[PDB]
Amino acid sequence: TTTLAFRFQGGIIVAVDSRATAGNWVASQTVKRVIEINPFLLGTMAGGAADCQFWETWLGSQCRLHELREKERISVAAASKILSNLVYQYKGAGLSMGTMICGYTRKEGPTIYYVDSDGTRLKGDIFCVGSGQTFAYGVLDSNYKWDLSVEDALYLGKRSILAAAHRDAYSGGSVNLYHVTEDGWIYHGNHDVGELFWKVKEEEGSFNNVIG
Amino acid sequence: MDIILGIRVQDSVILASSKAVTRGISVLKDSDDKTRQLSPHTLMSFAGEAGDTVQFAEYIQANIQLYSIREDYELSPQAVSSFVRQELAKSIRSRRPYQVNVLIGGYDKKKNKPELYQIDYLGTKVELPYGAHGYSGFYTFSLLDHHYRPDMTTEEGLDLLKLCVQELEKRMPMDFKGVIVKIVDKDGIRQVDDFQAQ
Amino acid sequence: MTDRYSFSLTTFSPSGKLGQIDYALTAVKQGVTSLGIKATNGVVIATEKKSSSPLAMSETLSKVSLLTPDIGAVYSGMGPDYRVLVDKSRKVAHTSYKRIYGEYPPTKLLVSEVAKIMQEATQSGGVRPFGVSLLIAGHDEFNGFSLYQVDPSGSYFPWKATAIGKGSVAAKTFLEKRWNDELELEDAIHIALLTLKESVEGEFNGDTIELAIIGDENPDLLGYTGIPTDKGPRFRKLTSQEINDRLEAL
Amino acid sequence: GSRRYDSRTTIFSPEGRLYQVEYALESISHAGTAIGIMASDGIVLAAERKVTSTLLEQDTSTEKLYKLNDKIAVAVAGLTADAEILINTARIHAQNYLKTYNEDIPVEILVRRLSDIKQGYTQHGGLRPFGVSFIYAGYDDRYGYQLYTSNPSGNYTGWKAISVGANTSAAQTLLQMDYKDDMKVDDAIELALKTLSKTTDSSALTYDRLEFATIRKGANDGEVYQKIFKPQEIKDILVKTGIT
Amino acid sequence: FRNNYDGDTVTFSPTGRLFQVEYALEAIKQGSVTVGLRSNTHAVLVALKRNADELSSYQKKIIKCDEHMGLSLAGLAPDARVLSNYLRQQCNYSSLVFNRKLAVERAGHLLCDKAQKNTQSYGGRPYGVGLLIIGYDKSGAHLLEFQPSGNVTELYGTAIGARSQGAKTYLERTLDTFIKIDGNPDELIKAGVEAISQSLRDESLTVDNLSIAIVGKDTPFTIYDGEAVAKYI
Amino acid sequence: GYDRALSIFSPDGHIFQVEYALEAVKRGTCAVGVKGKNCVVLGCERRSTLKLQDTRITPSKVSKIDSHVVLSFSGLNADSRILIEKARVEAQSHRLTLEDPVTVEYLTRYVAGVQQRYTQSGGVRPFGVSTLIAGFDPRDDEPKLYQTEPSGIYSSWSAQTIGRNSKTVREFLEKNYDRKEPPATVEECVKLTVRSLLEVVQTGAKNIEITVVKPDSDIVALSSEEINQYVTQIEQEKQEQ
Amino acid sequence: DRGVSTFSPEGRLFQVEYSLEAIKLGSTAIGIATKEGVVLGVEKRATSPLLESDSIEKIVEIDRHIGCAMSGLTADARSMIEHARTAAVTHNLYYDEDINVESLTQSVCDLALRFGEGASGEERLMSRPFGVALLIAGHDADDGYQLFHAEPSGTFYRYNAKAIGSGSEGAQAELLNEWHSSLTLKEAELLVLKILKQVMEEKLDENNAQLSCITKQDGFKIYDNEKTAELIKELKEKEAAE
Amino acid sequence: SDPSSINGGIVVAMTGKDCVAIACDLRLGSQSLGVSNKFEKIFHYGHVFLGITGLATDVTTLNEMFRYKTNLYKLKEERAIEPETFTQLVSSSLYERRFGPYFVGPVVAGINSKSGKPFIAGFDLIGCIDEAKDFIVSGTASDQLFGMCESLYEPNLEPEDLFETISQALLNAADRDALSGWGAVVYIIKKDEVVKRYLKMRQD
Ligand SMILES: [Mg+2]
Ligand SMILES: [Mg+2]
Ligand SMILES: [Mg+2]
């Protein structure tokens, strides 16, 4: 699995792969690794599927409750901490999760919080998580600029997942992209890695060693 | 473990704390501030187990902030540290112990003296001129033992921490990505933004 | 079912009076007389054995009780209430002191513990106060000899001599005249016998009186030899004959 | 059912007053007067003993003045036994704070906590309140000499001079008359004693009927000294001032 | 006299009466009428629903407890909800644990015991609702009448609620006739409606008014409301 | 174990205990709060039944719930302490979980919620306290002032007063406070407040305590002297005529 | 004294009936159900002119598709709203759908008789019934637009239009005559406004009354003062005709 | 992993002619790392001294607990706790945590204010009392101290001589223990006066 999220001029880019494996068995090539918390917040799934899926869908509920009570949109800082604090309550029981809580609020701007089952909660600009993280970080770090366009940004994220899907045996299937803006997130499609690899190869000239 | 150093000079306490957060195979962040202001004249740095570290520090801050308001007063650094020690000493025989080591640097407005307290995860508190947690002391204490003087200026302290950080960067195996340094004195707590090269 | 009486049964009346405490003190007033006299080298506590029938065996009912080897108690009021207060006092002497410090508590502190038990019966939910007043006499290394009175409210006070119960007013008066700070224990036993004689209606002898002293250490009542730090209990109940011998020197 | 026997100790009267508290304050007004006077260099606590006699051991006695700490003491007006219950919880709180912070507990913190306990008996639980009023005399590094007072309601306030118990109106009037902000302890002693002497319900103010304490910072030392006067010392100070 | 002996259910009067329970029985008497009657194949519940104004719905009186049992209520509705819930649970436990359908006689026994607990302890209050329970178990068709005192009785037909006595008489008369309506659901229902229409006075039973429920041989407890009761007026 | 229903409905639909709690408030010293364009001022009268107090220590009538929100009240002093302590804890708990200090409405809704709970829970009596909570939301500049009462009801006010004689001074504010030109200055806001208290306190300098709360955690308690300067200037816009 | 869950000789629970009396002293609230939405309007009733009227919350959102109005001891409703909101969100979590309006209502009404002093049956701690009534209105796919009146007795009825509060007997009478199966949202808003106007002591303006509606398309929305002023104006004119 | 060997340290108490002595080293370390050279292990509640060796967090906790308990004792009893009595209090306090003990080795030294008899006692971590008439040793260099004491000790020494004895017992025992040293302190206790002397010793 490879999931990433990065902050820039026009919001946040969230890109993830969609493979799930049980040992060497590829259980699914169509896993949804971005949990649509609500129309303004996104969370990435890494670690235990149920754990992430369950607690982030729960997070969505706690976020809706807050807004009903306070009549104001929940900040990413507060939404992340709800999950982070819950996860810390169960510390040692065995939950497994590495997730990015992404949002763009008026008060904070584009915000990403890395939250894991160890109880760590970190605010940052770029985060990759999963078995393929190292591969994604290579592409990201060398091409990331704060002034990227929403088109190039979407491309960088998509390419980073591809770098990982190629090399990491546990990542692949397809890439799911999302752009997070203040008025909410906009989904930028599901791209099959089979077809995306070849396109990128011919247009970019990369992956020279692969014959095709 | 992260790097946490503190040095009490004549009129202030300087805490230097590493900037990296490493999770497994990758360095996740290179700008982490491992410190919480407990009161306007008391700062605590911390190092330890992943989530426990911040959870503990934020719990202490909340508790000290509450006292200040109920009482309209700022506890002495010695009082804050004793409170911190008792909390750590409680968890040691708890269901799941906090594994956090802290350094508390505070300026006592009443005695008019800066003070540094070192307390490990077990609740072992000791007041010192300089201190550290984990392996940090292993490389730096020889330097501190040699060059330290009680009447040092803030600049002399900073120069010494720099030497300490240089030895750490030369012989210590992990890249801790530099340190964030903070000074605690009569005027409060300020972050020295000039340490990457001084 | 269940003790749903979680509210106080003793509450303040408009005049600031604690009704149940005043009524308990009245119960104490109708009880047999008991007194205690403190001498230079001892204390004597005494009371009359108001046997409620001649078929009863008066010896099987002790009104003067040992709380610790150096502390004794006597009362005036409701006997059963005193009996349970004695059990609780003997026990607390152990739980709050001997099992912690390895020594028996000093008189004032044991007194303070009984008093607390009585105060709580004055405020806790669903109980009425104890209808007894106690005179506790004892000795301890650092304070010497002492005599204390504890009332249904839980208030306690130290005395040189005092009397409680039926004729306590007259008796407290006889005691004020006879008492001075140079009395040896035999003299206090004497004055105790005299004071009691006036409160006692009928037969006055060693089978109708109960007296005990807190005096010198009694090694013959220890039960073992060999350890020199513990020299024996200072509490000793006078036997039927020991009282008679003193009544003849009236 | 059991509702039948419940006096309902925590209800408001139609006028918004707490019945039991008002009745407890009435009980208190019958207790010997306790006076506290705060000076620039110490505090004085004086109290008149209730229910005495020629036979009571005054030497081994304490029914009005109790040490809560080496720097804090209280004077009690009301039911002695209720007072001892509270006094002991105060003694423990003082030690809990010392253990936690390694500093002696500031006076107001101890006072507030005690009052909060009294207040509790006022709003929930169904138990009668404590029929006690306290005068707290204490010292700390933040405010120096302090004197506070708390009553059954759980309200507490601070004073330069105050009294609790019987004849408060009279005593307060006399205090407010002869009290001066720059008083010295030796002078406060006299005033406290003078005041009791003029408000006593009994014949003459004699030593055997008093308890007296002062908290002074003797200039030839540093630690604050709490002195609980012994019988003969009360007799001595009673002569110098002029009551014989 | 009374305010001395009617403040709690835990107090017996000098004549041995339980006034709180008797007052509970009164709430039932001010509730809308409901009839129950059965043959040897089906059991029907017919109930006149009541409204508050002419701008509101008509409060439901029939509750399904399981596929083979249900009841009609009269009195405090919140209480019927509490007791039908219990019945639903008890029915469920029988199926889950023993793979057995709870017998009506047993349901009645269970209801009685639940009601009794509320009449012997202080602080509580009796239930203030009556229930007609019909069902079809291993021994056939059943109709039971439950009263808050804990008394549950098995009957051929009955009715409870205001003016219940009318239908109670019609049924008591028509017994020989309805006890034989085997294999003909609609007839039984019609007898139930005829019965219930003897306790009317205010208005005539309309399509927003009537509620019927039937259970039997090859009929799982089913509730007919409004639209589907048209053919029975 | 004690759970007797102390607050219950009586025949006419009233809950006496709550109504009697209000009566306790009616007996407490008066508290007033009025808001300016960029400030809120809280004024309180000092209980004058007894005098010879040590002003340094005595529990102040206005209490900081956090660096930016204060609460004053009228009623049972002892009860106020319970509410104030709960408020202060919730204030720190909010900073810890939401990473932002409480808004004034939030803090109010909390205190009021506590008050209401004590009106329908067994074994407890309502708080004989009404509060005035004022301050500024984080990073905002619009002043806030709310009032809560024993029933747990709460709402915001341009100016409001509670406690003894509040009916009277409420009348003063109703025809001296204009929402078109709310006291555009700390100085004029304070004056209006004192004016209102002067109509009740009866010529007393030390008898009035004023607390001024401005944006961004700037809260100050005017000194005995700073206020006297106001009473004086006030006895002028009354004596010149 | 006499217990809190005691029945009267008529078979009515004393505390519930008295509860109903406290509700008769509260501001009027009216809800009208059409086939384009349900309108909820309430009388603000400030106790003095220094009160900032916008802080009077008597109409609250329960969920996007459910809103409610209150009348009586309004503070009592806070815990009720908390429950209703949590029930709806919780239902969404467990079932990935919107909770039916009847269900939301029923859940709220289950709280009602959960009062008493150790009432042998279950654990009901609340020393007394609620002293507020609620009008719950919303929309769900199976039964469309619905308006419910939830009382402290635990019983709730569905209504085409309903008024609660001080001017209820009068207001309900008007509603009885003006409601018909074909009202429009705009007509409903007008009626609510008219009837509130009638029973209110003060003269109705946009600052002492509040309207709201719930529609399938936009959900529950509280009408801001400007939208209502226009509607009030539109009323002055429609009435001033004949 | 051995809580009694993490921080290091030793305490020894000896009795003399109308006096007692209790001494300790000043090291606090973390395994091999010396951390503080100012960690005193001898505390006193009135005229009763208590030295405690072992895990430093417990040493600190116990001092705080005994201060608490002796403070309350003084208030209730209106007199300062005696050595014999305190000894019983320590023992009962340690055994209260029988199955989750404090990893310490307490040592009590003092003189009874009424009888004047010198007193010292030692305890294991669960409270067993060792009331010796000669000496008590505790710490990571307890074997060494036993060796030193068994040879160096002789009964009834005067304050001035006991000092030398206890000091040498301590000093040489510490120099053969890796986890002890870095300074030392000796208290010579008499009925009326108590003298505290810091010793000069190697700092390795
Ligand atoms: Mg050893
Ligand atoms: Mg060594
Ligand atoms: Mg070395």
Side-chain angles (χ1 to χ4, degrees), chain B residues 78-97:
Chain B
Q78 199 289 133
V80 179
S81 72
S82 292
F83 170 74
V84 174
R85 198 204 76 90
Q86 183 174 75
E87 290 300 298
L88 287 163
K90 281 182 178 184
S91 76
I92 209 47
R93 258 171 287 239
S94 175
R95 177 175 53 95
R96 199 187 57 75

PDB file of all heavy atoms in Angstrom, chain B residues 78-97:
ATOM      1  N   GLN B  78      10.439  24.610  40.834  1.00  0.00           N
ATOM      2  CA  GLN B  78      10.614  23.500  41.747  1.00  0.00           C
ATOM      3  C   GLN B  78       9.262  22.846  41.994  1.00  0.00           C
ATOM      4  O   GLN B  78       9.165  21.632  42.070  1.00  0.00           O
ATOM      5  CB  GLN B  78      11.205  23.987  43.072  1.00  0.00           C
ATOM      6  CG  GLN B  78      11.849  22.913  43.955  1.00  0.00           C
ATOM      7  CD  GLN B  78      10.852  21.968  44.590  1.00  0.00           C
ATOM      8  OE1 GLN B  78      11.029  20.755  44.566  1.00  0.00           O
ATOM      9  NE2 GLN B  78       9.813  22.523  45.183  1.00  0.00           N
ATOM     10  N   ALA B  79       8.215  23.646  42.116  1.00  0.00           N
ATOM     11  CA  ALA B  79       6.901  23.086  42.352  1.00  0.00           C
ATOM     12  C   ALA B  79       6.394  22.362  41.112  1.00  0.00           C
ATOM     13  O   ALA B  79       5.807  21.293  41.199  1.00  0.00           O
ATOM     14  CB  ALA B  79       5.936  24.181  42.772  1.00  0.00           C
ATOM     15  N   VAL B  80       6.611  22.943  39.946  1.00  0.00           N
ATOM     16  CA  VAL B  80       6.150  22.301  38.736  1.00  0.00           C
ATOM     17  C   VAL B  80       6.859  20.967  38.564  1.00  0.00           C
ATOM     18  O   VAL B  80       6.238  19.969  38.235  1.00  0.00           O
ATOM     19  CB  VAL B  80       6.407  23.166  37.522  1.00  0.00           C
ATOM     20  CG1 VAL B  80       5.923  22.453  36.286  1.00  0.00           C
ATOM     21  CG2 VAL B  80       5.703  24.497  37.670  1.00  0.00           C
ATOM     22  N   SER B  81       8.157  20.936  38.839  1.00  0.00           N
ATOM     23  CA  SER B  81       8.917  19.711  38.672  1.00  0.00           C
ATOM     24  C   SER B  81       8.481  18.622  39.632  1.00  0.00           C
ATOM     25  O   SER B  81       8.343  17.477  39.227  1.00  0.00           O
ATOM     26  CB  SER B  81      10.416  19.971  38.764  1.00  0.00           C
ATOM     27  OG  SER B  81      10.779  20.263  40.084  1.00  0.00           O
ATOM     28  N   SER B  82       8.253  18.960  40.895  1.00  0.00           N
ATOM     29  CA  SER B  82       7.781  17.975  41.851  1.00  0.00           C
ATOM     30  C   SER B  82       6.456  17.391  41.380  1.00  0.00           C
ATOM     31  O   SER B  82       6.227  16.192  41.464  1.00  0.00           O
ATOM     32  CB  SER B  82       7.621  18.606  43.215  1.00  0.00           C
ATOM     33  OG  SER B  82       8.887  18.950  43.739  1.00  0.00           O
ATOM     34  N   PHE B  83       5.579  18.238  40.870  1.00  0.00           N
ATOM     35  CA  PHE B  83       4.311  17.777  40.364  1.00  0.00           C
ATOM     36  C   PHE B  83       4.575  16.819  39.216  1.00  0.00           C
ATOM     37  O   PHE B  83       3.958  15.762  39.157  1.00  0.00           O
ATOM     38  CB  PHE B  83       3.480  18.958  39.884  1.00  0.00           C
ATOM     39  CG  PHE B  83       2.252  18.566  39.126  1.00  0.00           C
ATOM     40  CD1 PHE B  83       1.151  18.040  39.784  1.00  0.00           C
ATOM     41  CD2 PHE B  83       2.197  18.711  37.752  1.00  0.00           C
ATOM     42  CE1 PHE B  83       0.014  17.659  39.076  1.00  0.00           C
ATOM     43  CE2 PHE B  83       1.065  18.330  37.038  1.00  0.00           C
ATOM     44  CZ  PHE B  83      -0.024  17.806  37.699  1.00  0.00           C
ATOM     45  N   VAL B  84       5.474  17.184  38.296  1.00  0.00           N
ATOM     46  CA  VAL B  84       5.800  16.325  37.155  1.00  0.00           C
ATOM     47  C   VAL B  84       6.387  14.991  37.619  1.00  0.00           C
ATOM     48  O   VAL B  84       6.001  13.945  37.120  1.00  0.00           O
ATOM     49  CB  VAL B  84       6.760  17.010  36.151  1.00  0.00           C
ATOM     50  CG1 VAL B  84       7.189  16.028  35.072  1.00  0.00           C
ATOM     51  CG2 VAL B  84       6.078  18.178  35.496  1.00  0.00           C
ATOM     52  N   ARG B  85       7.285  15.027  38.602  1.00  0.00           N
ATOM     53  CA  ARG B  85       7.893  13.807  39.126  1.00  0.00           C
ATOM     54  C   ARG B  85       6.838  12.873  39.707  1.00  0.00           C
ATOM     55  O   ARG B  85       6.862  11.665  39.451  1.00  0.00           O
ATOM     56  CB  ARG B  85       8.938  14.099  40.209  1.00  0.00           C
ATOM     57  CG  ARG B  85       9.879  12.920  40.446  1.00  0.00           C
ATOM     58  CD  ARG B  85      10.534  12.893  41.818  1.00  0.00           C
ATOM     59  NE  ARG B  85       9.615  12.442  42.865  1.00  0.00           N
ATOM     60  CZ  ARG B  85       9.434  11.184  43.261  1.00  0.00           C
ATOM     61  NH1 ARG B  85      10.099  10.184  42.718  1.00  0.00           N
ATOM     62  NH2 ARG B  85       8.562  10.925  44.214  1.00  0.00           N
ATOM     63  N   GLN B  86       5.920  13.413  40.504  1.00  0.00           N
ATOM     64  CA  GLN B  86       4.873  12.595  41.090  1.00  0.00           C
ATOM     65  C   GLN B  86       4.025  11.927  40.031  1.00  0.00           C
ATOM     66  O   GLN B  86       3.592  10.808  40.217  1.00  0.00           O
ATOM     67  CB  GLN B  86       3.998  13.421  42.014  1.00  0.00           C
ATOM     68  CG  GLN B  86       2.940  12.603  42.700  1.00  0.00           C
ATOM     69  CD  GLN B  86       2.160  13.394  43.724  1.00  0.00           C
ATOM     70  OE1 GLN B  86       1.309  14.220  43.374  1.00  0.00           O
ATOM     71  NE2 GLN B  86       2.435  13.141  45.006  1.00  0.00           N
ATOM     72  N   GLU B  87       3.770  12.609  38.923  1.00  0.00           N
ATOM     73  CA  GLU B  87       2.981  12.026  37.848  1.00  0.00           C
ATOM     74  C   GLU B  87       3.708  10.891  37.177  1.00  0.00           C
ATOM     75  O   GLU B  87       3.096   9.890  36.835  1.00  0.00           O
ATOM     76  CB  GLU B  87       2.604  13.058  36.801  1.00  0.00           C
ATOM     77  CG  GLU B  87       1.590  14.068  37.268  1.00  0.00           C
ATOM     78  CD  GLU B  87       0.301  13.443  37.678  1.00  0.00           C
ATOM     79  OE1 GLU B  87      -0.362  12.820  36.831  1.00  0.00           O
ATOM     80  OE2 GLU B  87      -0.061  13.573  38.856  1.00  0.00           O
ATOM     81  N   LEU B  88       4.994  11.063  36.926  1.00  0.00           N
ATOM     82  CA  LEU B  88       5.779  10.014  36.298  1.00  0.00           C
ATOM     83  C   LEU B  88       5.892   8.840  37.254  1.00  0.00           C
ATOM     84  O   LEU B  88       5.631   7.703  36.880  1.00  0.00           O
ATOM     85  CB  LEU B  88       7.149  10.547  35.895  1.00  0.00           C
ATOM     86  CG  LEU B  88       7.138  11.475  34.679  1.00  0.00           C
ATOM     87  CD1 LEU B  88       8.415  12.256  34.598  1.00  0.00           C
ATOM     88  CD2 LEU B  88       6.912  10.681  33.423  1.00  0.00           C
ATOM     89  N   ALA B  89       6.184   9.110  38.516  1.00  0.00           N
ATOM     90  CA  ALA B  89       6.299   8.053  39.502  1.00  0.00           C
ATOM     91  C   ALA B  89       5.013   7.251  39.721  1.00  0.00           C
ATOM     92  O   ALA B  89       5.057   6.175  40.305  1.00  0.00           O
ATOM     93  CB  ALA B  89       6.774   8.611  40.801  1.00  0.00           C
ATOM     94  N   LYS B  90       3.869   7.784  39.304  1.00  0.00           N
ATOM     95  CA  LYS B  90       2.582   7.105  39.459  1.00  0.00           C
ATOM     96  C   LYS B  90       2.446   6.053  38.378  1.00  0.00           C
ATOM     97  O   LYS B  90       1.962   4.950  38.610  1.00  0.00           O
ATOM     98  CB  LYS B  90       1.406   8.083  39.262  1.00  0.00           C
ATOM     99  CG  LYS B  90       1.022   9.008  40.411  1.00  0.00           C
ATOM    100  CD  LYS B  90      -0.208   9.855  39.990  1.00  0.00           C
ATOM    101  CE  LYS B  90      -0.709  10.787  41.101  1.00  0.00           C
ATOM    102  NZ  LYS B  90      -1.947  11.520  40.693  1.00  0.00           N
ATOM    103  N   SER B  91       2.832   6.424  37.170  1.00  0.00           N
ATOM    104  CA  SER B  91       2.709   5.531  36.045  1.00  0.00           C
ATOM    105  C   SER B  91       3.653   4.346  36.060  1.00  0.00           C
ATOM    106  O   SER B  91       3.374   3.333  35.428  1.00  0.00           O
ATOM    107  CB  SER B  91       2.877   6.301  34.739  1.00  0.00           C
ATOM    108  OG  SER B  91       4.236   6.622  34.494  1.00  0.00           O
ATOM    109  N   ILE B  92       4.757   4.446  36.782  1.00  0.00           N
ATOM    110  CA  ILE B  92       5.711   3.347  36.790  1.00  0.00           C
ATOM    111  C   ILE B  92       5.148   1.985  37.225  1.00  0.00           C
ATOM    112  O   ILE B  92       5.558   0.938  36.710  1.00  0.00           O
ATOM    113  CB  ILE B  92       7.073   3.752  37.468  1.00  0.00           C
ATOM    114  CG1 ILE B  92       8.200   2.934  36.841  1.00  0.00           C
ATOM    115  CG2 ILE B  92       7.046   3.574  38.973  1.00  0.00           C
ATOM    116  CD1 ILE B  92       8.154   2.891  35.293  1.00  0.00           C
ATOM    117  N   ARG B  93       4.142   2.008  38.090  1.00  0.00           N
ATOM    118  CA  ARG B  93       3.515   0.770  38.544  1.00  0.00           C
ATOM    119  C   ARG B  93       2.061   0.739  38.107  1.00  0.00           C
ATOM    120  O   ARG B  93       1.213   0.092  38.719  1.00  0.00           O
ATOM    121  CB  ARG B  93       3.673   0.597  40.058  1.00  0.00           C
ATOM    122  CG  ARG B  93       4.794  -0.402  40.423  1.00  0.00           C
ATOM    123  CD  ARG B  93       5.137  -0.461  41.911  1.00  0.00           C
ATOM    124  NE  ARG B  93       5.859   0.730  42.325  1.00  0.00           N
ATOM    125  CZ  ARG B  93       7.077   0.739  42.855  1.00  0.00           C
ATOM    126  NH1 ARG B  93       7.748  -0.388  43.060  1.00  0.00           N
ATOM    127  NH2 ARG B  93       7.643   1.897  43.147  1.00  0.00           N
ATOM    128  N   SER B  94       1.818   1.409  36.986  1.00  0.00           N
ATOM    129  CA  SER B  94       0.509   1.539  36.357  1.00  0.00           C
ATOM    130  C   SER B  94       0.298   0.375  35.394  1.00  0.00           C
ATOM    131  O   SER B  94       1.196  -0.425  35.187  1.00  0.00           O
ATOM    132  CB  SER B  94       0.474   2.865  35.586  1.00  0.00           C
ATOM    133  OG  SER B  94      -0.716   3.042  34.840  1.00  0.00           O
ATOM    134  N   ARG B  95      -0.885   0.303  34.792  1.00  0.00           N
ATOM    135  CA  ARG B  95      -1.228  -0.746  33.834  1.00  0.00           C
ATOM    136  C   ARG B  95      -0.304  -0.617  32.625  1.00  0.00           C
ATOM    137  O   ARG B  95       0.314  -1.592  32.192  1.00  0.00           O
ATOM    138  CB  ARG B  95      -2.702  -0.605  33.418  1.00  0.00           C
ATOM    139  CG  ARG B  95      -3.198  -1.593  32.362  1.00  0.00           C
ATOM    140  CD  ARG B  95      -4.702  -1.451  32.091  1.00  0.00           C
ATOM    141  NE  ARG B  95      -5.111  -0.083  31.764  1.00  0.00           N
ATOM    142  CZ  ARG B  95      -5.239   0.391  30.528  1.00  0.00           C
ATOM    143  NH1 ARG B  95      -4.988  -0.392  29.486  1.00  0.00           N
ATOM    144  NH2 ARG B  95      -5.616   1.653  30.335  1.00  0.00           N
ATOM    145  N   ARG B  96      -0.200   0.595  32.096  1.00  0.00           N
ATOM    146  CA  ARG B  96       0.655   0.862  30.955  1.00  0.00           C
ATOM    147  C   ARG B  96       1.380   2.167  31.262  1.00  0.00           C
ATOM    148  O   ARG B  96       0.799   3.254  31.210  1.00  0.00           O
ATOM    149  CB  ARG B  96      -0.160   0.971  29.663  1.00  0.00           C
ATOM    150  CG  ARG B  96       0.692   0.788  28.410  1.00  0.00           C
ATOM    151  CD  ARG B  96      -0.065   1.059  27.139  1.00  0.00           C
ATOM    152  NE  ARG B  96      -0.631   2.400  27.126  1.00  0.00           N
ATOM    153  CZ  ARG B  96       0.060   3.516  26.932  1.00  0.00           C
ATOM    154  NH1 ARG B  96       1.366   3.488  26.734  1.00  0.00           N
ATOM    155  NH2 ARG B  96      -0.570   4.666  26.893  1.00  0.00           N
ATOM    156  N   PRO B  97       2.647   2.062  31.674  1.00  0.00           N
ATOM    157  CA  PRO B  97       3.496   3.202  32.019  1.00  0.00           C
ATOM    158  C   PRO B  97       3.884   4.158  30.884  1.00  0.00           C
ATOM    159  O   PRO B  97       4.187   3.738  29.759  1.00  0.00           O
ATOM    160  CB  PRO B  97       4.741   2.526  32.603  1.00  0.00           C
ATOM    161  CG  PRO B  97       4.225   1.223  33.125  1.00  0.00           C
ATOM    162  CD  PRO B  97       3.324   0.800  32.010  1.00  0.00           C
TER     163      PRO B  97
END
